[PDB]
Design a protein around this ligand. Structure first.
Ligand SMILES: CCCCCCCCCCCCCCCC(=O)O
Ligand SMILES: CCCCCCCCCCCCCCCC(=O)O
Lengths: 17, 59, 59, 223, 251, 223, 251, 17, 17
């Protein structure tokens, strides 16, 4: 989707852009 | 990269009057030049640099 | 001069004439040897396009 | 009116780069591969990282695994699809010594099983340093007596990767190559450093052979 | 410390350089109430209102002096000369910047003076001097410490103490001027307005201004000091205006 | 009561068109392919673009990669699925000279890895011109002296694509063909131009051989 | 009836001459929000924004057509050419006025069309045309009713029906154009803005515009009528702008 | 879905229709 | 998504973290 984290760990998130 | 369509010009320096020194002073001197980007500078289209290369893995 | 610090030294002296040239190089910050390996030139070689003013300082 | 978005540290470093590749063949009990994890065996990513003294980032890991058929004498070689296992062994953990080793039980070690023909496997890794930031350079020794190992290698205790064929060998040997790709994310950088000028020589130190500062031109006025 | 920028050219002076402004009048564009030509004037601005550097001259120990005729000296300088060639009428001010640097072990004094309508006398009393003798464009014409003989039919009487105008050279300070004393200064800056009896004039037939540099105290130094001391003149037109656009004149 | 939706510039240009295809075989160190990116090597898309003088669009890139088995002498050829790498090298970047070149580390160059049997790879590209619009025609030279190169080729500095087999060669050579498809999106067009009448002759210029304005009929009244 | 004055030059047309304005855009100076060069631009105005008349050509009974490359055609015209030589960058619009008068006993029709970025093809397929063949400055380059042979190494393919661009000549009406029908009109006036992919460009390396005059219906008349019918082209730069003042270029 | 951008770059969006 | 159970049995849920 637009932006939803699918995982419970911050390292799983996409890049900071 | 060098491309004549985007030539930027030339930078030159010339003697306006002369170097003038008293006696017992070395007439030959040196000038240091520094370069840096100003506040309006920007870059685009990331690429791999041509300055580093390799033939095998480093052990 | 490229294997010493003489590469950075621009000679200057007292002349017996007028309007002699001290130095001159193209404004090619990413492709010309004069500016290729400075901090600005090294940052530039990771990119393809550039835009902006260039600050030149002479001491 | 011109943005500097693409010169951010994130955009500069958040691109996948090959750091190593290893090979292993299914024709022996020693048919596995190992690699001590480090970012100093490839020129490009090493130079990009070494623009800074200290770094702090998460890591995205992607593997590209390909196989090639080796010469054989059996008629009609017909091999099923191959499944691979990649296991991470943190320092101090037991290491495999053969393909059929008990260590591949991976009860606590993180491991990934992947079958050929699918999308490349991918996992994320957090910031796992014992310090407050990763170190690209270390002007010091490992021993308090200032003897022995000197340099950045003292701080490299990141563990080892192990790779093997899961499938039992068939009627013809298969040689596989696994390419490891690192992509830093959520990057923080400190103490900018001059870009590396001399070509790299060794993995564990900064040794170099002296080279000129720039390329040359005929005279000071040549355009 | 202080930088003066005109167009794309910049010069630098001390923060207390004491710029001399003509007769107290800053250069300005011609006003409508005092204009006689009816066509719309051409004002090139940045393209012409910029610092032009003429050829440098050498201040020798026996130098008597130099002079330049102002509109003629810039007749071959970029777009200023082109507009001069293509227009029948023109008016302009000037910012004259004279540069001469020497060490603290040198001595000498120069008079930099701007003389309006500097009509000059001829060595032959029955003749008038020719254009080549009166002006050398960029090249500077030299004063002489001796007297030019009457044999010469069309030369300028260049005796310094009369300054080519039959006057007392020490009385030249009545014109806008500055002193370059090597002990204290290394430059002089004189801003002069347009001075004429008519609002506009032809830039080729009439030399409105004459810049004279005359060493009152000769240059001197001890053995070992640099013997070559140049004098460099940089002139910038100010509020240059033109009228009567037609075909280019040959001269 | 009749809409002109399908004659919009978007609908007219937003259709994928093959611009080039290249081949490479896995039987040599020179077994890679290169292509200098340009939209003037195919008649159809070139003519569609050249209805206008200036264009500004984003681009969707799609690759169709197929392979064919080459003759071999080994009995029982059994090759695993093939993985391909396509790397984009912007102008000035180092270029590969062999399949096993270090440049394929693609630490900063954008690259795509794709395995056969899956959906075609696809990526998007923004408007990357140094000018304010792409130019289809350029009545000028590259040199200020008006000598040398004349025409649209002066403005073509878009880079190069490189393609290779990732897998190591097996018991039989494999020849692969990659077809490149361009699809402009978010298109803006300016200065309409007469449609090209004479057949194209060269990639880098508008050279043509004179041809009649239309086909002919017998007389002015023939129906 | 209607007079158009630019600078010190004036042209006259019928009160209903129907001036054609480019793509509906009037020429204008470059705005700050779309400028990339940082130096202050030079805007000579009256000195450059005026009607320049090129050499006249003769409309013969077998004439195929003529063309001029716009910035090059004015490269030797007064102060416009001087500014072109002294500046690295430039942008300008144009007002093109084509004059061709004939009696009511004459017949003929001309297409006057302004073509942006008129890249031309070479007679030799492996080469590109040289500058002399592509443009003749003031002098007009002539279209040919025949086909140029491939032997010629660097000539322009000048077949009229393809118009040197590999297109249909009858489709040239998509570009801003006007028809000169001797039955009704004796002049055409096309005002074109600056059209480019960049806000400014070099005036010597890039010809932004090309003016083509092509007789679609050949000139004809009976015996006794005047056989010499000239075509005269008058062009005025509009809102000419320059940047990057430096030394003059040789070309 | 009906219309949701899945990417942070405008070039990733579908055609303007 | 962030957290939605897709199955009717508790044993199907992910780990307690
Ligand atoms: C199957 C699971 C795989 C898990 C792999 C874990 C990888 C360990 C993380 C390595 C981080 C490397 C940091 C580099 C530091 C430096 O810049 O010197
Ligand atoms: C694996 C990554 C692939 C990246 C490929 C980048 C392609 C560069 C973009 C090319 C744009 C071409 C524009 C055509 C201009 C014209 O109409 O003349």
């Amino acid at each position: 989707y637009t932006n939803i984290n699918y995982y419970k760990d911050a390292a799983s998130n996409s890049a900071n852009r | 990269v060098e491309d004549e369509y985007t030539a930027a010009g030339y930078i030159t320096c010339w003697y306006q009057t002369n170097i003038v020194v008293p006696a017992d002073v070395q007439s030959s001197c040196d000038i240091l030049c520094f370069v840096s980007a100003c506040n309006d500078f920007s870059v685009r289209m990331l690429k791999d640099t041509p300055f580093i290369r390799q033939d095998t893995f480093y052990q | 001069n490229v294997n010493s610090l003489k590469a950075y030294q621009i000679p200057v002296q007292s002349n017996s004439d007028n309007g002699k040239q001290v130095f001159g190089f193209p404004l090619q910050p990413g492709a010309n040897g004069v500016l290729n390996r400075t901090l600005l030139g090294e940052i530039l070689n990771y990119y393809t396009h550039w835009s902006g003013s260039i600050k030149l300082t002479f001491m | 009116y011109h943005s500097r978005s693409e010169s951010s540290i994130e955009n500069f470093l958040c691109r996948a780069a090959c750091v190593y590749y290893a090979t292993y063949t299914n024709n022996s009990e020693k048919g596995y591969a190992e690699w001590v994890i480090n970012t100093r065996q490839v020129a490009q990513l090493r130079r990009k990282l070494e623009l800074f003294t200290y770094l702090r980032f998460d890591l995205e890991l992607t593997f590209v695994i390909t196989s090639a058929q080796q010469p054989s004498t059996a008629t009609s070689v017909d091999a099923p699809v191959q499944t691979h296992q990649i296991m991470y062994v943190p320092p101090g953990g037991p290491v495999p010594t053969k393909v059929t080793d008990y260590a591949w039980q991976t009860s606590t070690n993180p491991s990934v099983f992947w079958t050929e023909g699918n999308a490349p496997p991918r996992m994320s890794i957090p910031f796992i340093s014992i310090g407050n930031a990763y170190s690209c350079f270390y002007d010091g020794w490992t021993q308090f007596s200032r003897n022995g190992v000197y340099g950045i290698n003292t701080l490299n205790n990141m563990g080892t990767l192990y790779m093997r064929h899961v499938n039992e060998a068939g009627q013809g040997p298969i040689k596989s190559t696994v390419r490891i790709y690192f992509k830093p994310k959520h990057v923080k950088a400190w103490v900018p450093r001059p870009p590396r000028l001399c070509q790299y020589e060794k993995q564990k130190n900064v040794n170099f052979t002296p080279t000129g500062v720039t390329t040359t031109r005929v005279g000071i006025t040549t355009t | 410390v202080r930088s003066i920028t005109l167009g794309n050219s910049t010069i630098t002076t001390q923060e207390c350089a004491n710029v001399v402004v003509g007769y107290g009048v800053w250069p300005e564009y011609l006003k409508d109430n005092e204009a006689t030509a009816e066509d719309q004037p051409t004002q090139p601005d940045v393209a012409t209102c910029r610092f032009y550097t003429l050829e440098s001259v050498q201040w020798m120990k026996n130098s008597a002096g130099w002079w330049w005729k102002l509109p003629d000296a810039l007749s071959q300088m970029g777009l200023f000369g082109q507009n001069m060639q293509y227009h029948y009428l023109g008016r302009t001010g000037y910012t004259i910047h004279v540069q001469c640097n020497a060490s603290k072990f040198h001595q000498g004094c120069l008079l930099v003076v701007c003389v309006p309508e500097a009509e000059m006398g001829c060595s032959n009393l029955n003749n008038t001097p020719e254009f080549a003798e009166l002006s050398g464009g960029d090249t500077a014409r030299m004063f002489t410490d001796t007297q030019i003989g009457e044999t010469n039919s069309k030369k300028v009487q260049t005796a310094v103490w009369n300054a080519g105008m039959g006057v007392g050279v020490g009385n030249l300070t009545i014109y806008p001027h500055q002193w370059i004393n090597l002990r204290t200064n290394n430059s002089a800056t004189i801003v002069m307005p347009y001075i004429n009896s008519v609002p506009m004039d032809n830039m080729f037939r009439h030399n409105n201004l004459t810049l004279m540099i005359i060493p009152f105290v000769p240059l001197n130094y001890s053995e070992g000091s640099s013997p070559y001391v140049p004098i460099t003149v940089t002139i910038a037109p100010m509020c240059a205006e033109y009228n009567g656009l037609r075909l280019a004149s040959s001269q």
